[PDB]
Design a protein around this ligand. Structure first.
Ligand code: DTP
Ligand code: DTP
Ligand code: MG
Ligand code: MG
Lengths: 860, 868
């Protein structure tokens, strides 16, 4: 039975929340539509995403039916389909955010009782309402495929023919294939597919491209561990040798580059992992490195070709007295030009080719040159630029870290040593590759120390963002909650955080039941383990609304405390669903292992530094000391004391509870100041609206931040004008008096007018873009405003590399799947410091990570 | 059906008068050796090497065998399996060996044909089956004919040795029930088909779609087969999807299957994947298809130049820091190192991206004073050529007669969309023709296939138009069908100065039966191919060594007589083969798809027939009239009579019972089976040199005269006293006796002994070199008349001094004489001199269309970087 904490039955889901109307549009130097209706306090980057990312533009009719069901209530009856109107208006597109809200949360609760997740009809609406309130309050949101593909058959009756998509009955447990692609929604965007050492059969190499391409066609991402593939030189039973791992990786990389995510600008999300003991590991590590060099040589050689080949055209037309010019015997400078196209390594074929054109009386040569733009032809020529490539490393390899031991790259066919190598020498290649370009790293022993069901195999791979780590051929449904939107007044709504987690743990399962999967194996494996992926975001957005730095043990404490609460309330919620409907079919097989993941969790939640069973690196305990504790750190010990006790009685409905996803698109309709576990990137940003947009404003985070500290209202406006500027040169900048000030704060003049970069005008008319060296503010209270990058042109302080990592390790001891992250390092970063970030990550109990040095790639 | 004997007697068997002897085959680097090779005495060392290293079953052949008695099966046709009881009397190493004699190959080849043909009811009596068994093996031993390599690899392994294995994804149709089945075994049903034409639909991930095609293609590449597909059904780039968004275009998905083909070795060997990609001239992306390989060759060259420049210019940066005095960061800055500022200057003058100059600077700061920047070259197998795309495909363009008309009329050309059929973009037809000319002139691609000439001879239009071909463009039929090939060595039918037409008709009939039995015995790599191959049963009988036959008859390749002979021999082959098909349809019925295409095929047969009677008119529904059989110029008037009689009988029997097979003849390249047959020339090709290298058993070669040169000059009438002087002019006297430029001396009398005997190697280290090692040509030779000189023209000039060769026109007109009597097409790639222009390449494509040719391809010498 579910409660009611944010709504009343009399007011419904929208009592206390207003409503407005805005207009979304595009145009180049013509997609439009204006009726789009959006709730209160909603931004337009929120409103505009929903208008063409999540709205349906056609296919719903004007007014349509209910259907008689008898199981459960009237308000959750499906809708199904024109002589009222002409050919038009039988053809309408969505227009209000409540239309999608009611079809998302309605289809949630509709299927929800079909499975019997409710006790009474009173719970159905008390859940149908309570969840729409969090959608309108931007409190939480599921993954984007749910924002559109859920509830079109429930609320509108949209349907069509289908194939390839297979599901299972929620009541019988039988494998079925779909006759419709809409009546069974598709809530999953992550997939961890498998691949075998085989070409043409199912589950093989060429089959995987067929499996990935139907994923890419729908918009989902996929990740695969390819180390099952035998290396280059491994023999064939009745033939010769294999081409190698990289040769087949380039087939899939080329296929990902040609298949768009549903046809739009979005690239294909694809992850390519390889074990450290693979014979072709050095080719895998240096894949992006040498392909990046091919891009560099393509632009250098093409320009050198275009120049020299025209200088050879020079000597034949500089000749006046004939065309004896083709001969490299008697011409003004053709003997100089042929040795000028040599000299620069131009192949002899294209030099004779150019004078072969001249003998036909030809004017030109069409030799295109290439650049370093990322959508160029050069990058499309090379491989790798469509895959995220990580490396699976065992703790044994990083125990040859210290002993300077020898590493065995073992063959796949006959499990025999193919080549020996110093481990640090191989570790040296990993540091250089990521320093210049990739690969990411995933610690195989750390991720499997928290694997809930190892009897069904080891954790071998991840999704394109390394956030979801379960068995192969498993999907996952996602949802993240905007953290700061429970924060009104000075306390934080723990009353609502656990109600949000408990309620959102349930809706995620209901689409493990509601779903229709792109393959039959993934369909059953999903039903068998009912994996979940609940996360949070915007924690960096509140951590200074809090009033305390991102790089602060007082902040990692709060992070690990609410990360413990969410995952604890989620596991305890899943144990409550296992007593009413039964644990997931794969639990009893692994009841001994899954329960050990949970006791290791709350041992890390009780702050204990010891007592861990089966972990390779003991997780970072939760800081009992430095947490602000608005009745919180004890609440984290409360849920896992209850999740362990409840799970011991009924098991668990889900094998995994939580993740941390890069809530990029989904964090925009939520008005999340920061995304995922990240901090904010600036104290100054912009924002669009109807007619024209991107009038610059001040990050509303630090007005409320300094309000938390001892400060008067006019006594922080203080610094906003110091940071956003005055929008005029009207009174005492260095470019006032004399040489029309309706630039209206764009923050350029269309100088050569003698101005020794005295752009304190920019510091004046447009603000310092930073609070470093600001009026009034106490020195000890500015580290609480450090961002991801140095704020502004003259800002110099930022959150260091360990600030990002230590924040991660504090949360990962209380999350099922890894935290997705790529930390920017300064251009100064050396190869030693790059491995230092990886080596620090494993010692801190992190499962996966990714680096990027500033200015390292030609894609700048 | 009755099978007669012409080459054997029942008492003599298959090898009566055929002597067998044993040789040695060996391979190594500056590895594998077979000390056991038994071959017919006439076989060369090269043919033995091909047999031993490619066709012999190298392992798994049991040393003791035992027959499996079957009911109704003659005893000599019984299967055999390992004799497990008698194998245990041997050391474990001797129980399963490899094949050792050509007889084993011959026996298991014809044994399986006779065995399966018997169960299929193809033989009237046991005597006919034994005659077939005997005549088949005799021809194989006598190098008169050969099936395509997959038959040499695979046919008879299960029938002769019981060799078996598991099988997935392969299918066949039961000859008795007609129901589709799945193979339990990988060897019981042989896989004799080498070429496949495959369809693809405008779909990404459904069966028959794009990604599924790569799976199908990969399945063929693993076994060693080649693929051909017309991709014109794929959406143009920018065509909207009804689910929202555009398609990324045809070239993007072509890049996928091209990258897959480069990563899959055909047959697992060092061989490359045989892949044919075809686009229609009205496709919206036709411009990117035409200039595809043109741009990729530039990308290769840019990689060669850009990498070496990146190497050279970035090493100098290190040398500027290493020879700096010793502050090593007042060394990394160019403000304190004058030589370093010169290096960065020379690096940016080379257009090297500065994002890469900051890296090597930051790299030197940490202590490393070295870097590996790999540099690429123009070799075909190196990393540069596999980085780019297209290299794993033969790109052909499919041209309509209306387009060629629009080029003549300077009309404009619409590029039709695939979804709605509306005009994507209008282009001038002539400038589109100029790109095809410029592309093929620069990087050999694209080739061309004439859609209307191909479908003018399509015998089964009710089941669709011929849309594509096989990798070498000889097989042309419906999509999702295969074809088994076999070629006859024409020269073997020439002895005592006359062409044994009676035996040629005999070999055609028996090999037509053989190829049809191969359809019945086969298993196929997909259900649709298995069903369609069962329903139409296309055969690919062909020939080789017509150029070697022409030279042996004293006829030039570029002559009316040589073209009239090939047309007659091609008319007899296809005529007898079609008449044999019609007779087989008399006893067992026409193929399932014939009844609805009868009026269509019989029309094709009539045009073949009227082409045989010499009529320059009398063709039904044909866009470009074929080259009718030259009646007055053929050197043997009896062959012109036999051609007319064969097509009269082929149509008469077709009118009665139809035909067992929808296609029947083809001209394959015969590259490997030509070596095993010891054909002087392959397919329709002429010869290439007047002196050749003979391979010795242990290793090394030594040059000899083209064996057809003495036979030619005899036919023309040159006396034996003149023959030896003409040959020694070409091959040389081997060793410095008779020279008039530098010979005997004034010196060594001791080291002279075998200074001189060491002069046959023919490296020679003025015109004294031409004396001992020969001119290697016949122009300017003693005794030889000037009107007989063209008889020795070859595709390439011979020797360093030789200057005449066969014209491009000679090649094309020889094709046109044969194409009129070929079911499919003729695999040909014409090599043109480096001096050729873009207009001359288009003229070659234009001349081929006007002469009834179905497809062609050109390679200008020196055009590709791949050519050393
Ligand atoms: N023709 C080929 N060229 C190159 N690599 C190939 C080829 N065929 C297969 N491979 C590679 C792909 C895989 O890495 C590996 C196994 O492929 P496949 O032969 O289908 O497996 P298999 O399970 O049948 O084993 P085996 O080949 O030993 O019988 O060999
Ligand atoms: N996501 C994609 N990105 C790029 N091209 C795509 C994508 N999906 C399909 N295509 C291309 C592949 C083909 O060229 C063409 C049709 O493929 P597909 O959409 O699967 O066909 P379909 O038969 O389902 O038709 P339709 O898209 O009209 O419903 O579009
Ligand atoms: Mg295999
Ligand atoms: Mg589609």
């Amino acid at each position: 039975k579910i409660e009611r904490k944010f709504t009343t039955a009399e007011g419904g889901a929208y009592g206390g929340v207003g409503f407005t109307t805005t207009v979304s549009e595009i145009r180049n130097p013509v997609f439009r539509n204006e009726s789009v209706e959006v709730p209160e306090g909603w931004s337009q980057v929120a409103s505009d995403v929903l208008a063409q990312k999540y709205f349906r533009k056609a296919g719903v009719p004007a007014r349509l039916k209910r259907v008689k069901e008898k199981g459960v209530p009237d308000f959750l009856w499906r809708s199904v389909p024109l002589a009222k109107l002409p050919a038009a208006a039988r053809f309408v597109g969505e227009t209000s955010a409540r239309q999608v809200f009611d079809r998302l949360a309605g289809a949630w609760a509709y299927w929800g009782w079909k499975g019997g997740y409710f006790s009474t009809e009173a719970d159905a609406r008390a859940y149908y309402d309570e969840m729409r309130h969090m959608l309108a309050r931007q409190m939480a949101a599921p993954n984007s495929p749910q924002w559109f593909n859920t509830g079109l058959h429930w609320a509108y009756g949209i349907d069509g023919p289908s194939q390839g998509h297979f599901y299972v009955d929620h009541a019988t447990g039988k494998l079925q294939k779909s006759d419709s692609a809409y009546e069974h929604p598709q809530p999953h965007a992550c997939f961890i597919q498998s691949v075998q050492d085989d070409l043409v059969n199912e589950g093989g190499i060429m089959d995987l491209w067929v499996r990935e391409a139907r994923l890419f066609k729908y918009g989902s991402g996929t990740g695969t561990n390819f180390s099952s593939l035998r290396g280059e030189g491994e023999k064939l039973s009745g033939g010769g040798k294999s081409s190698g791992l990289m040769g087949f990786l380039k087939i899939g990389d080329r296929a990902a580059g040609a298949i768009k995510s549903g046809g739009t600008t979005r690239r294909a999300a694809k992850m390519v992992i390889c074990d450290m003991d693979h014979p072709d590991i050095e080719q895998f590590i240096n894949w992006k490195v040498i392909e990046e060099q091919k891009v560099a040589s393509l632009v250098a050689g093409s320009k050198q070709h275009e120049a020299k080949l025209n200088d050879i055209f020079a000597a034949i037309r500089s000749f006046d007295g004939i065309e004896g010019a083709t001969d490299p015997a008697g011409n003004a400078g053709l003997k100089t030009a042929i040795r000028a196209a040599k000299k620069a390594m131009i192949p002899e074929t294209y030099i004779n080719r150019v004078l072969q054109y001249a003998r036909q009386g030809f004017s030109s040569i069409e030799f295109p040159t290439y650049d370093t733009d990322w959508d160029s032809e050069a990058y499309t020529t090379v491989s790798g630029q469509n895959s995220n490539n990580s490396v699976r490393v065992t703790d044994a390899f990083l125990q040859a870290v210290k002993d300077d031991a020898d590493w065995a790259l073992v063959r796949r066919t006959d499990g025999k040593v193919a080549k020996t190598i110093k481990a640090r020498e191989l570790w040296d290649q990993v540091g250089h590759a990521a320093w210049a370009c990739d690969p990411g790293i995933q610690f195989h022993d750390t991720v499997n120390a928290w694997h809930t069901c190892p009897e069904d195999g080891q954790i071998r791979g991840s999704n394109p963002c390394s956030e979801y780590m379960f068995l192969d051929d498993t999907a996952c449904n996602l949802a993240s909650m905007n953290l700061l939107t429970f924060f009104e007044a000075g306390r934080f709504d723990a009353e609502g955080y656990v109600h949000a987690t408990r309620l959102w743990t349930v809706t995620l399962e209901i689409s493990v039941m509601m779903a229709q999967f792109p393959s039959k194996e993934i369909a059953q494996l999903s039903y068998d383990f009912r994996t979940l992926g609940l996360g949070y975001a915007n924690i960096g957005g509140l951590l200074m609304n809090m009033g305390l730095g991102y790089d602060s043990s007082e902040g990692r404490a709060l992070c690990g405390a609410l990360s413990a609460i969410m995952t604890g309330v989620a596991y305890a919620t899943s144990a409550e669903m296992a007593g009413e409907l039964g644990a997931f079919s794969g639990y009893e097989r692994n009841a001994g292992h899954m329960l050990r993941v949970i006791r290791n969790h709350r041992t890390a939640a009780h702050g204990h530094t010891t007592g861990y069973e089966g972990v390779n690196v003991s997780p970072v305990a939760l800081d009992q000391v430095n947490c602000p504790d608005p009745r919180l750190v004890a609440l984290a010990k409360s849920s896992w004391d209850e999740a362990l006790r409840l799970g011991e009685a009924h098991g668990y409905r889900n094998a995994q509870v939580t993740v941390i996803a890069p809530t990029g698109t989904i964090g925009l309709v939520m008005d999340c100041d920061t995304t995922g576990i990240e901090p904010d990137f600036a104290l100054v940003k912009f924002k669009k609206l109807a007619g024209g947009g991107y009038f610059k404003i001040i990050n509303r985070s630090v007005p409320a931040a300094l309000e938390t500290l001892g400060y008067a209202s006019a006594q922080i406006s203080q610094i906003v004008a110091y940071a956003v500027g005055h929008g005029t040169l009207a009174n005492c900048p260095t470019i006032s008096h004399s040489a029309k000030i309706e630039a209206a704060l764009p923050s350029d003049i269309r100088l050569g007018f003698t101005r020794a970069q005295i752009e304190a005008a920019n510091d004046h008319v447009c603000g310092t873009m930073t609070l470093e060296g600001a009026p009034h503010l106490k020195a000890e209270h500015l580290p609480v405003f450090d961002c991801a990058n140095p704020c502004g042109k003259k800002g110099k302080r930022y959150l260091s590399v360990e600030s990002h990592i230590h924040m991660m390790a504090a949360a990962q001891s209380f999350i099922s799947g890894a935290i997705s992250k790529t930390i920017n390092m300064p251009n100064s970063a050396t190869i030693a410091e790059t491995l230092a970030a990886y080596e620090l990550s494993h010692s801190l109990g992190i499962k996966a990570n990714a680096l990027y040095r500033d200015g390292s790639k030609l894609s700048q």
